Design an enzyme around this catalytic site. Structure first.
Site, mmCIF file in Angstrom:
data_model
loop_
_atom_site.group_PDB
_atom_site.id
_atom_site.type_symbol
_atom_site.label_atom_id
_atom_site.label_comp_id
_atom_site.label_asym_id
_atom_site.label_seq_id
_atom_site.Cartn_x
_atom_site.Cartn_y
_atom_site.Cartn_z
ATOM 1 N N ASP A 175 48.913 25.451 33.157
ATOM 2 C CA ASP A 175 48.567 26.082 34.439
ATOM 3 C C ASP A 175 47.107 26.525 34.475
ATOM 4 O O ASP A 175 46.762 27.583 35.016
ATOM 5 C CB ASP A 175 49.529 27.231 34.757
ATOM 6 C CG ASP A 175 49.495 27.639 36.229
ATOM 7 O OD1 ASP A 175 50.039 28.711 36.552
ATOM 8 O OD2 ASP A 175 48.899 26.926 37.063
ATOM 9 N N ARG A 216 42.388 30.785 39.189
ATOM 10 C CA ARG A 216 43.232 31.976 39.431
ATOM 11 C C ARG A 216 43.802 32.547 38.127
ATOM 12 O O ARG A 216 44.188 33.705 38.081
ATOM 13 C CB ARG A 216 44.396 31.680 40.412
ATOM 14 C CG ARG A 216 45.472 30.768 39.824
ATOM 15 C CD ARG A 216 46.616 30.353 40.806
ATOM 16 N NE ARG A 216 47.304 29.203 40.204
ATOM 17 C CZ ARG A 216 47.065 27.938 40.532
ATOM 18 N NH1 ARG A 216 46.202 27.646 41.509
ATOM 19 N NH2 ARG A 216 47.700 26.966 39.897
ATOM 20 N N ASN A 217 43.863 31.715 37.085
ATOM 21 C CA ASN A 217 44.454 32.110 35.798
ATOM 22 C C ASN A 217 43.463 32.507 34.706
ATOM 23 O O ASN A 217 43.820 32.652 33.533
ATOM 24 C CB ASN A 217 45.465 31.057 35.337
ATOM 25 C CG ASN A 217 46.641 30.991 36.280
ATOM 26 O OD1 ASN A 217 46.949 31.992 36.931
ATOM 27 N ND2 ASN A 217 47.288 29.834 36.385
ATOM 28 N N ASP A 243 47.047 34.032 31.822
ATOM 29 C CA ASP A 243 48.324 33.463 32.260
ATOM 30 C C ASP A 243 49.010 32.635 31.167
ATOM 31 O O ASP A 243 49.439 31.509 31.385
ATOM 32 C CB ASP A 243 48.133 32.648 33.544
ATOM 33 C CG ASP A 243 49.431 32.018 34.042
ATOM 34 O OD1 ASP A 243 50.339 32.773 34.458
ATOM 35 O OD2 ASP A 243 49.535 30.766 34.020
HETATM 36 O O1 LIG Z 1 42.370 43.238 38.542
HETATM 37 C C1 LIG Z 1 41.616 43.742 37.721
HETATM 38 N N1 LIG Z 1 40.394 44.263 38.066
HETATM 39 C C2 LIG Z 1 40.089 44.572 39.433
HETATM 40 C C3 LIG Z 1 39.372 43.408 40.058
HETATM 41 N N2 LIG Z 1 38.971 43.850 41.403
HETATM 42 C C4 LIG Z 1 39.890 43.323 42.448
HETATM 43 C C5 LIG Z 1 39.387 43.817 43.787
HETATM 44 O O2 LIG Z 1 38.053 43.344 43.945
HETATM 45 C C6 LIG Z 1 37.218 44.076 43.053
HETATM 46 C C7 LIG Z 1 37.524 43.606 41.649
HETATM 47 N N3 LIG Z 1 41.856 43.882 36.363
HETATM 48 C C8 LIG Z 1 42.914 43.259 35.735
HETATM 49 N N4 LIG Z 1 43.043 43.011 34.449
HETATM 50 C C9 LIG Z 1 44.235 42.370 34.199
HETATM 51 C C10 LIG Z 1 44.699 41.949 32.962
HETATM 52 C C11 LIG Z 1 45.926 41.324 32.929
HETATM 53 C C12 LIG Z 1 46.675 41.112 34.068
HETATM 54 S S1 LIG Z 1 48.253 40.310 34.041
HETATM 55 C C13 LIG Z 1 47.794 38.650 33.769
HETATM 56 N N5 LIG Z 1 47.904 37.970 32.648
HETATM 57 N N6 LIG Z 1 47.436 36.705 32.888
HETATM 58 C C14 LIG Z 1 47.058 36.651 34.145
HETATM 59 C C15 LIG Z 1 46.510 35.623 34.925
HETATM 60 C C16 LIG Z 1 46.207 35.846 36.207
HETATM 61 C C17 LIG Z 1 46.484 37.216 36.699
HETATM 62 C C18 LIG Z 1 46.071 37.446 38.089
HETATM 63 C C19 LIG Z 1 46.149 36.435 39.028
HETATM 64 C C20 LIG Z 1 45.729 36.708 40.312
HETATM 65 C C21 LIG Z 1 45.242 37.964 40.627
HETATM 66 F F1 LIG Z 1 44.828 38.230 41.882
HETATM 67 C C22 LIG Z 1 45.164 38.965 39.681
HETATM 68 C C23 LIG Z 1 45.586 38.703 38.397
HETATM 69 N N7 LIG Z 1 46.993 38.197 36.014
HETATM 70 N N8 LIG Z 1 47.273 37.857 34.747
HETATM 71 C C24 LIG Z 1 46.233 41.521 35.301
HETATM 72 C C25 LIG Z 1 45.010 42.145 35.330
HETATM 73 S S2 LIG Z 1 44.219 42.753 36.726
#
Ligand SMILES: O=C(NCCN1CCOCC1)Nc1nc2ccc(Sc3nnc4ccc(-c5ccc(F)cc5)nn34)cc2s1
Length: 247
Positions: free
Chosen positions: A110, A114-115, A128
């Protein structure tokens, strides 16, 4: 006792502390997956900090917080001003992360912008995978793998070519006028994604190699890190990449 160093103490994701900022995700196989995922360690791969089964957990997968979230949303944000250099550098980091994973015989399945996640240093981590895995993905899937449901590192390579295309269009959907059930027929007509406007010729050649009809003829991630690092080295960060109006 094999999972104890993975274990820490006193669905969808939510915030978390320890201070270190984190993301927390929410039985024998869960403890196995912790240990295996804990063994992957590379600056361009999202590391597992630890797990929580205690007591009872839910369970809880604890991952480092990624300040800048996913690579796709980051390049799409109109208040960001990436250059050709930046975007290619992001591609080069993904390729390094995948070269590591491929060396561990790990097949992602995948790989997509996005990942991939971005930290405070703008280091790209391929995510992911393992416990963190979650949701077809038709538009990133190698042709043979759509046809046979078998996935290889060479099918990740095809996916990586689509991810480079995302990078160079700043997060445009691939094949927008194409519906997912029809992508096999579309590709078998003799078609590839078109060259983005701000994609350098040598990098479009790399994408086309990633999409070679013969899986064995595609470049390894090791050859991709080499090739992309050279292309990357020729840019100085003077070319601003804009977004297409049609996407
Ligand atoms: O989101 C932020 N930071 C804020 C960013 N902001 C957003 C608003 O704009 C300003 C900037 N930090 C994070 N760290 C982590 C660490 C781990 C995880 S779980 C995980 N494990 N593999 C994956 C692969 C993909 C996705 C994913 C996909 C689409 C999305 F949309 C968001 C997350 N998740 N995922 C989530 C987060 S989220």
């Amino acid at each position: 006792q094999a999972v104890q160093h993975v274990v820490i103490g006193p669905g969808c994701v939510y915030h978390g502390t320890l201070k270190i900022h984190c993301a927390v995700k929410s039985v024998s196989q869960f403890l196995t997956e912790g240990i295996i995922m804990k063994d992957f360690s590379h600056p361009n791969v999202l590391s597992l900090l630890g797990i929580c089964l205690r007591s009872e957990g839910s369970p809880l997968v604890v991952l480092p917080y990624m300040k800048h979230g996913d690579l796709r949303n980051f390049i799409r944000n109109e208040t960001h001003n990436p250059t050709v250099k930046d975007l290619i550098g992001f591609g080069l980091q993904v390729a390094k992360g995948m070269k590591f994973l491929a060396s561990k015989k790990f097949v992602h399945r995948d790989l997509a912008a996005r990942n991939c996640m971005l930290d405070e240093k703008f280091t790209v981590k391929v995510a992911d995978f393992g416990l963190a895995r979650d949701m077809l993905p038709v538009k990133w899937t190698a042709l043979e793998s759509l046809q046979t449901q078998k996935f290889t590192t060479k099918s990740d390579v095809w996916s990586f070519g689509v991810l480079l295309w995302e990078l160079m269009t700043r997060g445009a959907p691939p094949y927008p006028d194409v519906n997912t059930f029809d992508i096999t027929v579309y590709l078998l007509q003799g078609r590839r994604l078109l060259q983005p406007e701000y994609c350098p010729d040598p990098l479009y050649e790399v994408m086309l190699k990633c999409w070679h009809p013969k899986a064995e003829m595609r470049p390894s991630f090791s050859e991709l890190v080499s090739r992309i690092s050279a292309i990357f080295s020729t840019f100085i960060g003077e070319h601003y990449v804009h977004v297409n109006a049609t996407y």
